[PDB]
């Protein structure tokens, strides 16, 4: 004996997985790993971030101060969850550029409220309504204040509230729209209503509109909600002669990392640093096909439901 | 792959071989055998571990983003908000597809190479004591038991010892 | 002979083609194929998609019902072509947020019109003008309805149109702007004009303006075009007291695959699944430099007008 | 080429070769001839057609989008609509350029590798019956008529048959 | 000697540089080059481009013609530099859609002013104020013209300024907001003031508002600034009965390569084709991490502060 | 690299070599010398300059863009402006990070392949007058002075001249 035979080679596996390459569309390798997060947990986790269940309240209803949203008067959040089963159980209201106001409150990430004693001379405060019951008796949005004529006349109101603080003050206010012509002179005396909120930088003048609207829990009127931000040093000034929905104070704006999301998912105890409308997902992968709406330390959404990254050589089994 | 070792000049893989990614199969005086090479295996595993750690290093921490779903129809600005998110996703989708295409095409190549390297590293050891039969198989022309084949795995085969014997058996 | 020579090698060609790589800015290869679709047919194709030529009508002129756009009364499309050679031959008008209405009508991709019998009490209908001649005699937009005083007084109108259909109704309406103060009290009796369209979710109130505008085929006035979408279950309600340009009915909205495109190209019989302002192009290549405006199954636009992809080895001929 | 075969140790290609991409030219007792290889030619054309199917015929379907051309100047939001469209065109243009670059650089490498694989394939057949002249040419040290070449072309050349003749011509 | 050893090798170095790869995160090569421009000069180079320092004037202050911005009446620029230490020293004004006007002027790249003769019958021109001194005596925005009643009455003015020129004219105009009800009848006689600019392709009617604003250098009133572009052939028309801030003429629009930039960077002599808010940077590296805001032939901004590019092989020294 | 020459069968580089990227070393009847190989060094540095010219061939001129910083809080359209920019940055950040990774990987590959190309070129010249010692070293079996070594460097070594002596020294 005086010979040998040394041969070389590589391993193989029975079940090789398929992957995509520059050349071959479907090629089989010994192993792979998924880079697209396709599945989810099914419920939102709330140990990583402070998730606040919005319940039947929307972000703007809770902001205004709706009778059934008295729980969210001073509470704050990292993420707010608006439910599709949400209602507004107070006066019928609309907001031009609704989303802007919604976004500002969401980005702020809080609803704390510092009240301020305005000088309301010659008018009556705490104006209520039957279509906004705070328990049972008539009421109104807690952060707002419905003013009406005090006795025989309505004086041209004039108040100022200087910002001596070192942050952006957010005053929420509005204007009222009576149902009929008798009602303008009844509640507010003055024939032509008007409101003029103005800073040193800008102005906002609004005019009411007397006319019937659809039936909303016993009312054919409206209240157009507006808002005004005031910077450090800058001064607030309101100048109205009727139909003024006055502010009780201001919200504290902060440059935070807070947001809002429309979801109907369950929010139970667990840890997961990404959140989608279908609950939390693991952020170990770089990509995902769960949902385009994301919050927190999340992977990037893509159209594909799977992408296989080969983690082993080309499989070529025996015959 | 491109180097033509895996699924190329080597016929196929070995499902028997379970303790490594690359190795030898021999026939000598003390019967036949199989041995998985640890160095070349470990190398190829490190490169693929390296890829994983690069792709799975970071996921960006985002917070308040634009509205991507809508109830009412607004008109101008809602279309732009859709178009940004539509364009954003299309670009990342292509970035994801291209990445996984490049990576895998590179993965089959570096693994193919590590076969071709081990084959050559073994040719270079044997010197003029062994010829090349074909299909990744050397014909050694001298008595090489499991200790000798052992020196061929570790990288300590001294061809001088067996040279005279092998050069006699090749050309007589 | 007791020997033989065996030389390996590769093929070559005389007229090669240059390409760009990672290293070389210009390197010659045996073969290449074009990835940029730079050329075009010069005419829009019409068998793949229903392409509808607007001609002298714009999308909104045909929508409103301009005398010269009686052809496009009930027609629908996949892609509507607005010509540069197009005019408005009716009452002089304008639209706040013009592009939004043009976009919603384009995405709707239809102009079918279901009329509705509104209860107009104390006002005359079917008002017309000399600047909007329908054939010869005076007329007006076919989907709008000019309301003026009927005799001695203009009453405060008050109609209601409930949506019992299960889709989004689009009521197109507007307001009139008289040229003079005499014309306000002449045509509409009441001194101050006003219009208030109000659904349950929102409210739109508009005020007209008495003043002289540029001379547009006789008329020194204007009509601002508005619109109001009404969801299933919601109810429509107008509250006006003069200057009301009433809605005749509603258009039928739908989430389709339709759009609108500005083009002065010829639409001749061919087949292609990609349309531009220049015409149709083949979508076999993945890129194009013809026009950034695209519609259908098209290749993406890029700044490059040519990209030679290598379909062969490097070319190196004989000496 | 990164393997150094095409435009490398092979001086140049043959314009006369019109029956394939790679091939053999030979001189022998029966004269001189040329023939193109079909296997190594096929492999290269398969990898190129593989790329060409991936890039081609995945054009996406898009319908209603934002306006990208304006008559009047609107200021704030118009600039954004142009900017988003500007951002889209730049990123896709980059991607297109990067794709074309990587594909072409890989196209030259796989066509180069194939040439090199066909060479080592031939060496392996010839065992100790032929030396490496240079310029990718082999000196076969025994009489090799067209039948002997035909066998080499089809991968059925048996070196044992011509060993004793060749091995003596190489060493005397 | 009857034998010869012939080894092959490659070079190595003592202090190699680390880089990232597809496999290796920190692999050491012989030599690498930076691709992310991190440092800046600390000042804006104003030779590559005509850079104009606004100084204490904002681009809109100089446009209107603020007393302390008389230097910027005919001056033009490639890049206008607004400063943080800039003020508005004239009448208290605001602009709805402010940034839009700021963009149009910045993009045009010129404040050259061609004046025109308007027939202002029955009113007085060159109205001024104490909060806008031009040296000492009361003055106003030089390109605007405050009109008030002549003697006993304010006539309903109505002027036409046709565009016989072959380019886009940009007229600047506005409306005045008095502080009190006396002032409306004092200055403008007519009780309800109004302004109605209207081209052939559009209309822009505006209404003033009588009310107190904050104390801005004496004045408790406001002026809302507006603008109207007129295309070749199209005619300009104004129609007012009070509160008209008349246009003196028009600015010349042009599709230039100009822009505006907020910065407190020094502007000294040098040459550089990329200008940031931090000063110019060299445009040889493809990426930069100085600022996301840019102007000129600039590298693309990214979040990374460094990305080394291997310009050499792997480095392996001797033991 | 992937070719396993640099940081491979060539155990380490040469800090002594200061006049080239790849060169030779030797020992013979006229002492022991070092000598760079320019053609390989020139092939290496041309490609790297190619990459660096491709990366540095354009910087897109850009003028009036959207506002990327704000003072007040506006709401809807301000988010979209921040989003469009934030999206744009992330995508370029990726494009920059991948480019670096791919390019650097290719750099270590093409530098390695050139090291190997030179080795196979030098082998091909020697023919049967030298055997691979391993470590990236040959062993020539005849007296090869600096005149002899010089012919190899300049690609002009005739094996026939030294065949008999070497072929006799290899097998005796
Ligand atoms: C506390 C007190 O006693 N105050 C009054 C004080 O109001 C008043 O000062 C004048 O007030 C009027 C408003 O009624 C103007 O505001 C005056 O400002 C001037 C100005 O800017 O210099 C005069 C100028 O001629 C005016 N120009 C025009 C075209 O009208 C402007 C203009 O009316 C307004 O400023 C715009 O709102 O104002 C201001 O001096 C004085 C004099 O009545 O008496 C004090 O007792
Ligand atoms: C302050 C006040 O008395 N508000 C009354 C209102 C107003 O008359 C209308 O809302 C105005 O349009 O009508 C009612 C209601 O809303 O339930 C009863 C309520 O007492
Ligand atoms: C419905 C109506 O009143 N039409 C009349 C109009 C209007 O007075 C103006 O168009 C309003 O500005 O003027 C005229 C005309 O256009 O020929 C006579 C016509 O009878
Ligand atoms: C034996 C082995 O390595 N199996 C791997 C496992 O580690 C992992 O789940 C993945 C690669 O990361 O694919 C499989
Ligand atoms: C959210 C929550 O906590 N409670 C209520 C629930 O009582 C009620 O049945 C439902 C009806 O829509 O609305 C929700
Ligand atoms: C005439 C000719 O040689 N054409 C070539 C051929 O390879 C092929 O038809 C095409 C697509 O790959 O590329 C080109
Ligand atoms: C100190 C040093 O290593 N300098 C080198 C030099 O060749 C060149 O300036 C640069 C750009 O490639 O690469 C590095
Ligand atoms: C009342 C009045 O003067 N109206 C005129 C109008 O007739 C004319 O078309 C326009 C052109 O200057 O000016 C205004």
Automatic annotation (TrEMBL), chains A, C, E:
The keyword S-adenosyl-L-methionine does not apply. InterPro entries: Capsid_hemagglutn, Hemagglutn_HA1_a/b_dom_sf, Hemagglutn_influenz_A, Hemagglutn_influenz_A/B. GO terms for cellular component: host cell plasma membrane; viral envelope; virion membrane. Keywords: Clathrin- and caveolin-independent endocytosis of virus by host, Clathrin-mediated endocytosis of virus by host, Disulfide bond, Fusion of virus membrane with host endosomal membrane, Fusion of virus membrane with host membrane, Glycoprotein, Hemagglutinin, Host cell membrane, Host membrane, Host-virus interaction, Lipoprotein, Membrane, Palmitate, Transmembrane, Viral attachment to host cell, Viral envelope protein, Viral penetration into host cytoplasm, Virion, Virus endocytosis by host, Virus entry into host cell. It comes from the Viruses. Disulfide bonds join 45-270, 57-69, 90-132, 274-298. One of its GO terms (molecular function) is host cell surface receptor binding. GO terms for biological process: clathrin-dependent endocytosis of virus by host cell; fusion of virus membrane with host endosome membrane; fusion of virus membrane with host plasma membrane; virion attachment to host cell. Its main location: host cell. Glycans are attached at residues 1, 15, 31, 46, 56, 278. Pfam families: Hemagglutinin. The keyword Zinc does not apply. It is a single-pass type I membrane protein. It is found in: Host apical cell membrane; Virion membrane. Homotrimer of disulfide-linked HA1-HA2. Belongs to the influenza viruses hemagglutinin family. Binds to sialic acid-containing receptors on the cell surface, bringing about the attachment of the virus particle to the cell. This attachment induces virion internalization of about two third of the virus particles through clathrin-dependent endocytosis and about one third through a clathrin- and caveolin-independent pathway. Plays a major role in the determination of host range restriction and virulence. Class I viral fusion protein. This is Hemagglutinin. It comes from Influenza A virus (A/eq/Newmarket/93/(H3N8)).
């Amino acid at each position: 004996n005086n010979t040998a035979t040394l041969c070389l080679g590589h391993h193989a596996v029975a079940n090789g997985t398929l992957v995509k390459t520059i050349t071959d569309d479907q090629i089989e390798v010994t192993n792979a790993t998924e880079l697209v997060q396709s599945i989810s947990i099914g419920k939102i986790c709330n140990n990583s971030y402070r998730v606040l269940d919005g319940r039947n309240c929307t972000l703007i209803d809770a902001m205004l101060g709706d009778p059934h949203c008295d729980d969210f008067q001073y509470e704050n959040w990292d993420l707010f969850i608006e439910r599709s089963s949400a209602f507004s159980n107070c006066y019928p209201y609309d907001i031009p550029d609704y989303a802007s106001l919604r976004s500002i409150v969401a980005s702020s990430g809080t609803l704390e409220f510092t009240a301020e004693g305005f000088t309301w001379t010659g008018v009556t405060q705490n104006g209520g309504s039957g279509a906004c019951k705070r328990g049972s008796a008539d009421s109104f949005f807690s952060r707002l204040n419905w003013l009406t004529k005090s006795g025989n006349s309505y004086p041209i109101l004039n108040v100022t509230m200087p910002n001596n603080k070192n942050f952006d003050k957010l005053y929420i206010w509005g204007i009222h729209h009576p149902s009929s012509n008798k009602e303008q002179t009844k509640l507010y005396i003055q024939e032509s209503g008007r409101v003029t909120v103005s800073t040193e930088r800008s102005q906002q003048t609004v005019i009411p509109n007397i006319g019937s609207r659809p039936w909303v829990r016993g009312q054919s009127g409206r209240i157009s909600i507006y808002w005004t931000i005031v910077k450090p040093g800058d001064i607030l000034m309101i100048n109205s002669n009727g139909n003024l929905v006055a502010p009780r104070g201001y919200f504290k704006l902060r440059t935070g990392k807070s947001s809002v999301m429309r979801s109907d998912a369950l929010i139970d105890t667990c840890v997961s640093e990404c959140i989608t409308p279908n609950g939390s997902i693991p952020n170990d992968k770089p990509f995902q096909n769960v949902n385009k709406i994301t919050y927190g330390k999340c992977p990037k959404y893509i159209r594909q439901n799977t992408l296989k990254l080969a983690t082993g050589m080309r499989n070529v089994p025996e015959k | 792959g491109i180097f033509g070792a895996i699924a190329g000049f080597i016929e196929n893989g070995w499902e028997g071989m379970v303790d490594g990614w690359y190795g030898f199969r021999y026939q000598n005086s003390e019967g036949t055998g199989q041995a998985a090479d640890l160095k070349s295996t470990q190398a190829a595993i490190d490169q693929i571990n390296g890829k994983l750690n690069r792709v799975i290093e970071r996921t960006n921490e985002k917070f308040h983003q634009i509205e991507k779903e809508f109830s009412e129809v607004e008109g101008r600005i809602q279309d732009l908000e859709k178009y940004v998110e539509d364009t954003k996703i299309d670009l990342w989708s292509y970035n994801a597809e291209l990445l996984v295409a490049l990576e895998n095409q590179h993965t089959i190549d570096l693994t193919d190479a590590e076969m071709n390297k081990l084959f050559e590293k073994t040719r270079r050891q044997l010197r003029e004591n062994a010829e090349d039969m074909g299909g990744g198989c050397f014909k050694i022309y001298h008595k090489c038991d499991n200790a000798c084949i052992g020196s061929i795995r570790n990288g300590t085969y001294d061809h001088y010892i067996y040279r005279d014997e092998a050069l006699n058996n090749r050309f007589q």
